[PDB]
């Protein structure tokens, strides 16, 4: 089990760790989060009690270092930092647990929610989309734009996501204009899966990453990316049965986890009616279709 300590909590803030969240009051004796499952990627995220604008947070994998949080009163936010002095870090962590100033990552033993949301999210791959190499963790926030959004403005603070564009020379083979645009199997299987991702696991890795950023930070370009990558599979007549089956699981947990009241902003009516009712895969997403009809019948 890992620990992410906090130097202190000077400002009132709601802290999230994965899908959990808890309020901390201004200068309350809070010193961080303990019992965090090793073996998964995590995100710790923040919304100031004073400025619900700008949700922000840090993706990290405890195996890649000792990490802690420290408020910076110049920049005005909780910053993640690495402690390379492992001795100093264990000493710090032990003192704060002894004083019991830490909240426990509160995983119910039955619950595989976080695993199912993050199954293929590699942390080295996150680094190549939120490019900031001097850090082992990655910062994201509500306002960061994607590389493709900057095509249609700072590249360093961008989310380099795989560029998907259904009306592009990449998507469309000359002489197969009608065929490739109505059935995108070639774009999916050869261009994307065989040329960019290498395998469906990597496709899912970015797709999951795109969703979580949309959900935890209301990041609009991520939401667009999540829908694009779904749409590309739903608009392909030829998809391996195993990808379809795993996509159905993936989307099921994402729909399951979404806040019931955020549905109107994080779900694109058009893409989902296509996946569920119009597209080649209308018959192939049974779990996803069942939870959507029972939880968001208004959208369809």
């Amino acid at each position: 089990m890992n620990t992410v300590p906090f130097t202190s909590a000077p400002i009132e803030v709601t802290i999230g760790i994965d899908q959990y969240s808890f309020n901390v009051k201004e200068n309350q004796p809070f010193h961080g989060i303990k019992d965090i499952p090793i073996g998964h990627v995590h995100v710790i995220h923040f919304q100031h009690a004073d400025n619900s604008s700008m949700r922000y947070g840090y993706w990290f994998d405890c195996r890649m270092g000792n990490f802690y949080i420290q408020y910076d009163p110049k920049d005005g936010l909780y910053k993640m930092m690495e402690e390379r002095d492992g001795a100093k870090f264990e000493n710090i962590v032990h003192n704060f647990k002894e004083r019991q100033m830490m909240v426990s990552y509160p995983k119910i033993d039955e619950d595989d929610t976080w695993y199912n949301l993050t199954e293929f999210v590699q942390m080295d791959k996150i680094r190549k989309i939120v490019r900031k190499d001097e850090n082992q963790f990655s910062y994201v926030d509500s306002s960061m734009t994607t590389v493709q959004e900057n095509e249609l403005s700072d590249p360093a603070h961008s989310l380099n996501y795989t560029v998907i564009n259904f009306k592009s020379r990449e998507a469309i083979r000359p002489g197969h204009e009608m065929e490739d645009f109505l059935d995108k199997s070639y774009y999916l299987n050869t261009v994307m899966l065989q040329g960019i991702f290498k395998n469906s696991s990597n496709y899912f890795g970015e797709l999951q990453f795109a969703f979580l950023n949309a959900m935890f930070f209301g990041n609009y370009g991520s939401s667009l990316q999540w829908h694009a990558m779904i749409e590309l599979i739903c608009s392909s007549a030829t998809v391996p049965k195993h990808m379809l089956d795993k996509l159905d699981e993936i989307l099921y947990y994402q729909i399951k986890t979404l806040p019931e009241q955020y549905s109107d902003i994080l779900l694109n009516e058009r893409v989902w009616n296509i996946c569920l009712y119009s597209s080649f895969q209308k018959n192939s997403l049974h779990n996803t279709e069942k939870i959507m009809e029972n939880k968001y019948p208004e959208l369809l």
């Binding site: 009306k167 592009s168 020379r169 469309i172 204009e177 009608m178 645009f181």
Partner: protein, 237 residues
């Protein structure tokens, strides 16, 4: 973006543009089969591509052979239309290529856009106008060349005859669409109007009769009366 009443005069500036209408590309008769089921039989069609400033018409003839063994022909027709427009642009010298193509039906935007990916600098636009170019097959010489074709064929016309010698393209285009709006609302009456007088002929290299300026004025008012009427006859007013 969309073309409508407000940006009407853009059609007559000096940026090369074409209208594309696909309403006559896929044409069928519907008949009964021996077993009493219904079946379609395709007939030749055409793509109506028109430069509204010059009157040049690139009438691409769609021979029924293109449909043989295909499914979902109505959808294919849109992509075939886009394929042919694309081929046409590519065959024109650069200085003759259009800067905009305006499709008369929104369902053409995606097919053309995809076919025109090689030409990012050519704008594909819809329109909110209700243009009567479907009545293009009510022009006898155009219907004639379509119905006689034995193979895919492109035939060039000036849909304004020599009108531009005496009037502007704004006026020429308004005369054309009035003529076509009438031919669409009542083809018999429209055609009667145009040809009642045997002494006004259609030159061999023209499509419409050789009216004087004054005769065109009488013709134009007659087509107006026809349209307003059929509007009454239809809504009883």
């Amino acid at each position: 973006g969309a073309m409508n009443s407000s940006n009407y005069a853009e059609l007559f500036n000096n940026d090369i543009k074409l209208f594309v209408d696909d309403t006559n590309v896929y044409r069928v008769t519907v008949h009964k089969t021996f077993e009493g089921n219904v079946a379609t039989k395709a007939i030749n069609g055409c793509i109506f591509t028109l430069n509204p400033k010059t009157g040049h018409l690139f009438l691409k003839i769609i021979h029924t052979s293109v449909w043989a063994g295909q499914k979902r022909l109505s959808q294919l027709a849109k992509w075939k239309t886009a394929e042919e427009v694309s081929a046409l642009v590519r065959s024109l010298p650069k200085e003759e290529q259009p800067k905009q193509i305006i499709v008369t039906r929104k369902a053409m935007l995606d097919p053309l856009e995809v076919h025109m990916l090689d030409f990012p600098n050519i704008a594909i636009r819809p329109t909110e106008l209700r243009l009567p170019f479907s009545a293009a097959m009510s022009i006898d010489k155009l219907s004639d060349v379509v119905m006689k074709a034995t193979e895919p064929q492109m035939v060039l016309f000036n849909i304004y005859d020599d009108w531009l010698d005496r009037i502007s393209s704004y006026t020429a285009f308004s005369r054309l669409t009035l003529l076509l709006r009438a031919l669409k609302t009542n083809e018999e009456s429209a055609k009667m109007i145009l040809l009642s007088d045997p002494t006004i002929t259609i030159k061999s290299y023209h499509l419409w009769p050789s009216f004087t300026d004054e005769q065109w004025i009488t013709i134009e008012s007659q087509m107006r009366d026809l349209i307003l009427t059929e509007y009454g006859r239809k809504y009883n007013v």
